[PDB]
Design a protein around this motif. Structure first.
Motif, PDB file in Angstrom:
ATOM      1  N   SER A  31     -28.092  33.923   9.490  1.00 11.34           N
ATOM      2  CA  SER A  31     -28.693  33.019  10.471  1.00 11.34           C
ATOM      3  C   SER A  31     -29.917  32.331   9.878  1.00 11.34           C
ATOM      4  CB  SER A  31     -29.106  33.827  11.702  1.00 11.34           C
ATOM      5  OG  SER A  31     -30.070  33.116  12.458  1.00 11.34           O
TER       6      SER A  31
ATOM      7  N   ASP B  73     -26.472  26.113  11.218  1.00  9.85           N
ATOM      8  CA  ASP B  73     -27.349  27.168  11.749  1.00  9.85           C
ATOM      9  C   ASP B  73     -27.350  28.374  10.755  1.00  9.85           C
ATOM     10  OD1 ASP B  73     -24.554  27.665  12.353  1.00  9.85           O
ATOM     11  OD2 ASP B  73     -25.164  29.190  13.826  1.00  9.85           O
TER      12      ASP B  73
ATOM     13  N   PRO C 160     -16.742  27.893  13.856  1.00  6.39           N
ATOM     14  CA  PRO C 160     -17.337  28.974  14.661  1.00  6.39           C
ATOM     15  C   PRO C 160     -16.417  29.418  15.789  1.00  6.39           C
ATOM     16  CG  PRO C 160     -18.882  27.139  14.384  1.00  6.39           C
ATOM     17  CD  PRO C 160     -17.546  26.653  13.945  1.00  6.39           C
TER      18      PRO C 160
ATOM     19  N   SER D 288     -24.761  34.828  14.665  1.00  5.82           N
ATOM     20  CA  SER D 288     -23.917  33.642  14.469  1.00  5.82           C
ATOM     21  C   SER D 288     -22.448  34.027  14.590  1.00  5.82           C
ATOM     22  CB  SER D 288     -24.205  32.998  13.113  1.00  5.82           C
ATOM     23  OG  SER D 288     -23.495  31.778  12.979  1.00  5.82           O
TER      24      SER D 288
END
Ligand SMILES: Nc1ncnc2c1ncn2[C@@H]1O[C@H](COP(=O)(O)O)[C@@H](O)[C@H]1O
Ligand SMILES: Nc1ncnc2c1ncn2[C@@H]1O[C@H](COP(=O)(O)O)[C@@H](O)[C@H]1O
Ligand SMILES: [Zn+2]
Ligand SMILES: [Zn+2]
Lengths: 299, 296
Positions: A56, A107, B145, B16
């Motif tokens: 992250s 990110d 993601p 994440s």
């Protein structure tokens, strides 16, 4: 020519970028045997976690990494626009232009050290038990420092034992490991010294941070002469972070206070390169005791 | 999701989606599966281990950017002067965005393990008769993601690659489609082998997927993980024609542009498939499975 250059042919293949190499089966078998040796030294009650090569970006920013080593950070970027924007970027690339103008940060960052993701993980478990927590962590790390030297890579494997607890738990752990790590290097037949050290903090303020860190004895390195005895290579580091991570992540120790942390870091690629530079690329000629500790037939 | 309960004993969040820390239990199984794939390595196969990053120019040359621009993870850095880098950090300190000082590096996060092998093979000159075989591995990245345990952004890929004549690639493909099913069968996995397509981006890509599936360019070993209707591709066989031979100037023993193919093992999907199939208690795994993984 660098003294390590002669090793390149048997150990690596070029990937078209300095400090980024494909590993041969010979090189990789030694990295794995060194990894298994570090594992055999794992203390009871140590939790093993294996991290991916990315983490992250917000956790890394929060950990204070940009303030210390902004020039080393590898950030993940991507084409995050609309289909129209992405098609245009690809079309510009097709027309000999630059598609990278359409990149924006993700990110995520490429992990600069294996321990960083462990601190928020430990913080999310609540107050620490007495004696603190121990972790065994590993990651493929990235540092934006291109070099042609075989001991200065951009992508390399890091293995660490991390202690989170009171200043006493950390100090004891660090002392235990400075003894154990020297016994491991000695058994590996490596020549070294343990010395006071500092992190390569960036810029003019970084020179101040480094001198202050070195004087406070917050970092030691196990240094091995590769290119010279004058400029040895740090193949292991012994880091005491005081309460930096305890404060950042709200980790509380037994005495209710912000937890102290330390880590013993093993540079897997530097250790393997140190082994091949010391003992040569012919495993059958490696010393009997060295072959034995790595689980190769001793004689 | 049916795989969700597995996350507790296999993974830890890293803040994440699709990016997880692995437990000792999960990692011991990935390594045992890797050792099992290794035991099936043909004689004369050269093993290379790639880092998680590769040359951006090599990737651009391979055509990945034209097919999956949305999946690519590039490496950026603060490449300016000390004055510029200090200002970026100072902007971050003042509530601004330091990322405006980022510029692309000459590197990308590898989207597949085989990509770096083609320029390596091309640099050696003409191929011997029978071609070349490689055993490659890398931690790969795909910018997709997801909260599903079988759809990761960072995952391990293991591949066997064939470079040579169309005859060499065809023989290798046949051999591997048999060997891969024997491996999954021995692992006690339920699967089917079916025709496949890569997830090409956009509307022009949907027709590329149709054109790829109509051709037999891609076969996948699919395992029901969420449902039997929507199985998970845990392995694939890919035929690249002379795309890489032409791009890199690889010439076969007959002086023609080399053809290439690869058998890809999704290490993380295979491990997840193992835990979903057999559970998280290794002591209860079937004896033949424990035996082939060296657990007994
Ligand atoms: N650029 C690099 N190339 C190879 N290994 C490295 C590099 N930077 C750090 N390491 C290894 O990782 C260990 C821990 O890094 P550090 O965080 O600088 O103390 C070092 O002691 C080295 O052994
Ligand atoms: N997003 C992902 N997460 C985890 N494993 C993946 C992912 N994408 C691909 N794989 C694995 O990698 C293998 C080859 O990927 P591909 O080149 O798309 O065919 C597949 O057979 C999957 O097992
Ligand atoms: Zn550390
Ligand atoms: Zn491939």
């Amino acid at each position: 020519a660098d003294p390590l250059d002669h090793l390149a042919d048997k150990l690596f293949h070029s990937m078209g970028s300095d400090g980024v190499y494909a590993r041969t089966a010979l090189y990789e078998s030694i990295v794995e045997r060194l990894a298994a040796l570090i594992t055999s030294h794992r203390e009871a009650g140590t939790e093993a976690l294996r991290f991916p090569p990315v983490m992250s970006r917000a956790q890394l920013e929060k950990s204070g990494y940009l303030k210390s080593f902004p020039n080393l950070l590898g950030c993940v970027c991507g084409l995050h626009g609309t289909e129209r924007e992405i098609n245009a970027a690809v079309s510009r690339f097709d027309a000999g232009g630059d598609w990278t103008t359409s990149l924006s940060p993700a990110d995520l960052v490429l992990s600069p050290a294996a321990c960083y993701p462990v601190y928020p993980i430990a913080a999310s478990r609540g107050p620490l038990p007495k004696g603190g927590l121990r972790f065994d962590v590993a990651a493929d790390c990235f540092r934006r420092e291109p070099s042609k030297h075989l001991d200065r890579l951009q992508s390399f494997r890091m293995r660490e034992y991390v202690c989170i607890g009171t200043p006493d738990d950390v100090s004891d752990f660090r002392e235990r490991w400075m003894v154990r790590a020297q016994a491991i290097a000695r058994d590996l037949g490596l020549t070294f010294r343990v010395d006071y050290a500092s992190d390569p903090f960036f810029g003019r303020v970084g020179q101040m941070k480094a001198v202050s860190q070195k004087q406070q004895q917050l970092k030691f390195e196990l240094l091995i002469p590769l290119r010279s005895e004058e400029q040895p290579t740090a193949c292991m580091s012994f880091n005491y972070h005081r309460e930096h991570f305890g404060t950042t992540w709200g980790i509380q120790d037994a005495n209710g206070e912000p937890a102290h942390t330390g880590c013993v870091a093993f540079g897997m690629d530097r250790l393997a390169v140190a082994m091949f530079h010391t003992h040569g690329t012919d495993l059958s000629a490696w010393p009997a005791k060295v072959r034995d500790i790595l689980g190769l037939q001793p004689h």
